[PDB]
Amino acid sequence: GITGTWYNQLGSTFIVTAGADGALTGTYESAVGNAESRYVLTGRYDSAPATDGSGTALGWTVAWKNNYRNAHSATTWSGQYVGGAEARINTQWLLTSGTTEANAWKSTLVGHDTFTKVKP
Amino acid sequence: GITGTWYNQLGSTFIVTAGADGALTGTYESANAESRYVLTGRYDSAPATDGSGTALGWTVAWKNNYRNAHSATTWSGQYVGGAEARINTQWLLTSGTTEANAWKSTLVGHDTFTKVK
Amino acid sequence: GITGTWYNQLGSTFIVTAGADGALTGTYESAVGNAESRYVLTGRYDSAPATDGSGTALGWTVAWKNNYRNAHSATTWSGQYVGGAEARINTQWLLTSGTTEANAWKSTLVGHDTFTKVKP
Amino acid sequence: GITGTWYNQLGSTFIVTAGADGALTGTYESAVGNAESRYVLTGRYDSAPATDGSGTALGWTVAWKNNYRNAHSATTWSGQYVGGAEARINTQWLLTSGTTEANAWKSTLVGHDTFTKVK
């Protein structure tokens, strides 16, 4: 299932536990950006997905502050878990930095990450 | 300044506690108990003090004890304090789909939250 | 209709002509970023919208190169025109910069612009 | 390097001409290529990109109306072209449908497409 250790296409490490109540908890270690070591993540997933072959919807957030760095920013990943021989979590993400109002127009980056249980 | 009740532009209500460890926890009501859902997320607990906003994000999975849309929304944005405080966000809403329908699985939009209705 | 001079919430100026064949042409002047004076835009719109009260879908692109500056980037706006007492074009946009592969993960900003024929 | 036929990961095809002035013009279609699947495309690209190894920024729009059908929607692709023997156009896209105001919150889909010169 969702619980386990996942890697995105750039080598970031996503260590997640999916709880009975729909909770996602764990740590994220980024391979890019103003980041170093692990950061806390929390999120939610559908704990009773459809039974028609559909994926399992989920999302989570990392605020890029830990005991060693603070980038004044946060990423959310929104996506779905797809089971099978090679399980996969396909996501799109938004990375918002704290800005002044005049700079808010350039506050948010967008991209897509795919996660598997093997290193890229 | 984040902890409390917030209201978006379309009649939703966003109730949150910002914990000392960077946690966001609370409930989201998209319109009674049938419409309330758990939310969890994170925020920058040590933001800059130069006029910049406070970065944050949270997730709602659209399942409760009454309904299940097989979908989840993430909001990514920043809190801005002051007399007219706001949380300005962009969001992604992914539905569980088959592989053939995955290309149309994700909606995008934006929400602005205020402390007054 | 769509043809006219529009302004977004930051004061950018969008001068557009909607042709009978579905073509959008005109110029864009940005209130923000590495930009000066007018830039070419081209795009498309639905020349036969639904008759059920729905808006009119459209989109356009600006490459941020003109005779004065070149930011090595391009924005696309995707949205719909909504007729009314206060006509409005509501959009969401993607701004992609030319980058190296190592920097591609942070190549794309995302936002939302609303345009009116009155400058806010 | 942009002018020619490109294929995405899901069976769509587009033929584009990159003009000297920065114009993109052409047609977007399905793998089958039947007339009912073909739509006009129009966009812009950076006609003087950097020389430091960066990609070439571009974007284009397709409104999903042709002589045969009308989905009352339009997609914009925003991305960069990367040349070489394994040339690519890497994009993210937004697909907005015309909606009433009550339904505008769910008017816009987002995704990503990768285009290659080979099927």
Considering only CA atoms, which of C51, C64, C54, C52 is closest in space to residue C93?
A: C64
Residue A13 phi, psi (nearest 5): -115, 125
> With an 8 Å Cβ cutoff, are B107 and D111 in contact?
no
Strand partners, B93: B73, B107
Nearest CA in chain C to B112: C112
Tally A–D CB contacts below 8 A: 9
Number of neighbours of residue C40 by Cβ within 10 angstroms: 17
Is C81 annotated as belonging to a binding site? no
Tell the CATH topology of A1-119: Lipocalin (2.40.128)
Q: Which residues of D touch B (CB under 8 A)?
A: 10, 94-95, 105-111
**Dihedral sign for Cα atoms in the order A115, D88, C71, D53:** positive
Q: C109 to chain B: which residues are within 8 Å by CB?
A: none
Q: Kindly report the CATH number that applies to the domain delimited by B1-117.
A: 2.40.128.30
How far away is chain A from the Cα of C33, in angstroms, using its nearest Cα?
Answer: 9
Question: Cα torsion for D5, D7, D8, D10, to the nearest 10°?
Answer: 140
Residues of chain A neighbouring B59 (CB-CB closer than 8 A): 24, 42-44, 58-61, 76, 78
The SS3 assignment for A60 reads strand
Against chain D, the chains showing at least 3 CB pairs within 8 Å are A, B, C
CB atoms within 10 A of CB C17: 11
Of C43, C82, C92, the CB nearest to D61: C43
- The string of DSSP letters for chain D reads ---EEEE-TTSEEEEEEE-TTSEEEEEEEESS--GGG-EEEEEEE-SS--SSS--EEEEEEEEEE-SS-EEEEEEEEEEEEE-STT-EEEEEEEEEEP--GGGGGG-EEEEEEEEES--
Strand boundaries in chain C, DSSP class E? 4-8, 13-18, 23-29, 39-45, 56-65, 70-82, 88-97, 108-116
Q: Which residues contact A95 (CB under 8 A, 6 or more apart)?
A: A73, A74, A75, A108, A109, A110, A111, B76, C106
**Phi, psi dihedrals of residue D102, rounded to the nearest 5°:** -60, -25
DSSP state of A104: G
Q: Judge: D108–B109 Cβ closer than 8 Å, yes or no.
A: yes
Residue A37 is encoded by which pair of tokens?
A: 């070591």
Chain C residue with CA closest to A104: the answer is C111
Q: What are the strands, taking DSSP E only, across A1-120?
A: 4-8, 13-18, 23-29, 38-45, 56-65, 70-82, 88-97, 108-116
In eight-state DSSP terms, residue C10 is T
First to last CA, chain B: 17
Phi and psi at residue B92, to the nearest 5°: -130, 130
Q: Are B54 and B37 in contact (CB under 8 A)?
A: no
Sign of the Cα torsion A67, A12, B110, B95 reads negative
| Calpha distance C28→A116 (Å, rounded) | 42
User: How far apart are alpha carbons B11 and B31 in whole angstroms?
Assistant: 6
Method in brief: X-ray
Tell me which residues of chain A have a C-beta less than 8 Å from any C-beta of chain D: 92, 110-112
User: Given an 8 Å threshold on Cβ–Cβ distance, is B61 in contact with A78?
Assistant: no
Alpha carbon distance D86, B115 (integer Å): 52
